[PDB]
Amino acid sequence: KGEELFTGVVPILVELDGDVNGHKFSVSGEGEGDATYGKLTLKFICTTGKLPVPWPTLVTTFVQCFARYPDHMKQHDFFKSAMPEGYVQERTIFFKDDGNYKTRAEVKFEGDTLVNRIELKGIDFKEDGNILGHKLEYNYNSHNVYIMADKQKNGIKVNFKIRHNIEDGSVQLADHYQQNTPIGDGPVLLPDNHYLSTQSALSKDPNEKRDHMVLLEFVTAAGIAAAGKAQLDIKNFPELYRTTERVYKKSGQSTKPVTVSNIHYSVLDGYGRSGEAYGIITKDMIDMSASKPEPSGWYSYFFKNTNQRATESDYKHSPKNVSKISNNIKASILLSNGNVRNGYLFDRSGLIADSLGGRPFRNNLITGTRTQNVGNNDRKGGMQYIENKVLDHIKRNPKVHVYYKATPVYQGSELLPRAVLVSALSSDGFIDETVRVFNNVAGFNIDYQNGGLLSSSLQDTVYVNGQSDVYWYNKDSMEMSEQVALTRGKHHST
Known part of the structure; x- marks a missing residue:
């Protein structure tokens, strides 16, 4: 009330x-x-x-x-x-x-x-x-x-x-x-x-x-x-129940009895951003998983006449006056392990992975870097590290289930999360951790507010590469918005 x-x-x-x-x-x-x-x-x-x-x-x-x-x-x-x-x-x-x-x-x-x-x-x-x-x-x-x-x-x-x-x-x-x-x-x-x-x-x-x-x-x-132990309250999780494959999957011909939970995805927040997702992962959900939308920050929007930054709602309320532009970037990068990755910097990254039973709803996606999603794609980093840890454990312990939660971390009104906190607690206790998976990629300055990269009442544009403790309103006195600059602990020049 x-x-x-x-x-x-x-x-x-x-x-x-x-x-x-x-x-x-x-x-x-x-x-x-x-x-x-x-x-x-x-x-x-x-x-x-x-x-x-x-x-x-x-x-x-x-x-x-x-x-x-x-x-x-x-x-x-x-x-x-x-x-x-x-x-x-x-x-x-x-x-x-x-x-x-x-x-x-x-x-x-x-x-x-x-x-x-x-x-x-x-x-x-x-x-x-x-x-x-x-x-x-x-x-x-x-x-x-x-x-x-x-x-x-x-x-x-x-x-x-x-x-x-x-x-x-x-x-x-x-x-x-x-x-x-x-x-x-x-x-x-x-x-x-x-x-x-x-x-x-x-x-x-x-x-x-x-x-x-x-x-x-x-x-x-x-x-x-913060990272550490799983830090979960299991009483809040959707409960395990027994059903059949076709009924759970909502498709296909298989009548096989399965034990599963219904994964919880959050309603998009007021800024249109995906929030936390959680559920209990079982061997059957993994086995059964074995046309994507775009999450917040995937596109930028601009007024056709002004070339001034617009919002998505502006784009909705009048596409004739507003240009939509992809924020994604294709590049070749040198990875930690010495391998070269040629591909797009950003992924439509699942909070609860497809392999764990996650669905490609917008509510289960963030604009995540390829690094955030798979690290070096060697089962040791990114979301992939904790996903594969869960997959492998359930494979070797088929009657064990895993309480699993992915929590995007946002600052301010930023449309890209800075990180995802992934918590996993197996029912035998051998997995019990929260990992912080950073939403970044080496060498590039990400625009967390709008998506994409940073370009060359509070101010729309202040000047900071971009990690300096000081920002300026004018370039000829010595990106990003003043709002993001300040929530990141920077201060205006004295």
Whole structure:
């Protein structure tokens, strides 16, 4: 019921009453959030004068109710379930070898506006340190945080570490301890453990004379965030059941009894991007598998008259005015093993492989590099490594099944994933891993935002080969968009 308040765009107001080392300041912020996309934009003003701490140290303090939860996870969304009455969010933020913030915030609706009202008290800061000395860079890195239920308080708890880059080249660490409790007495969702992935882009308003920050944030929930063990909850998987071959395959003449599960593919997200796919793989599904669509990022679109970049929807709403162009590239590459690969750089890459029982629905495809998909095609890398590991294990252990999940990892509104996390847990335990498969290819600079390669309010084009920590608005002062540049931790030149 609280989730229903977030199906459209929601106005946001932020107000912070601050005291650091006994010195008072106030900040006001306003903007809007669209949880369908996990996207919010806010502009903050220090109304009392100069902000006495660095803007980046307040980004976490300045509305996790705007996270996009995948549909099959929506039951784990505590933040929205507390609305409209809201929740209290309390943190202690320790700055290593310096002081600490303690914050208390109420996040709730006032009329049709989502308000974040915060009190902050900072103590024990060093006058010449990175904080009071303003030695932090104006940038921000992507971070994943692990949400856990706090049953004792009918809420959630989170502990996480933020890395603030410093101007000389070091990092300032900030350890965050967080507790959230409902304000209302009504029922709320107490979640299973999960992650929120956040990307934050900081900028300035050219017309704003006061001390200020513009913040663009993307927040999405996921069950997995890093490589390691399988990290799966099997209770969430579609269950094994018994049927027949022709009935499962929906084609052919074979009447052979089989044990299988129905693989779950996600609905495409608001940007049209494929999401996670999971199921239980069996020997019969493998045996039975033994006209593709194009996923997001496969084409670029441009206005015929302007030659300015268009969107796919523009192409749909008027193909007569919009050109569609393939992003793919054919090239010859030298592989690690010394072999030469002549072929297309990108594949319509299956999240759950055909060989495991996966289907060629758009929902099961990403725009993946050939390397991402098969590595060096020697069973040792890419998606192929973990697929073949599963195939081979089930071949040698025919009664064993494998819980299998492929989770694309996106940043911002980018149409190509940066990586795929593949989790596999066999029912005999011998496979128990999550691998991170990077969506890249040696030697080329991929355009993750639009697909294809990088060519030679935020800005459409800033200048960075493309891995520099600094970007410029103009080339004659010394690609990619400013939004991608900032979510990748880069900063504008001082």
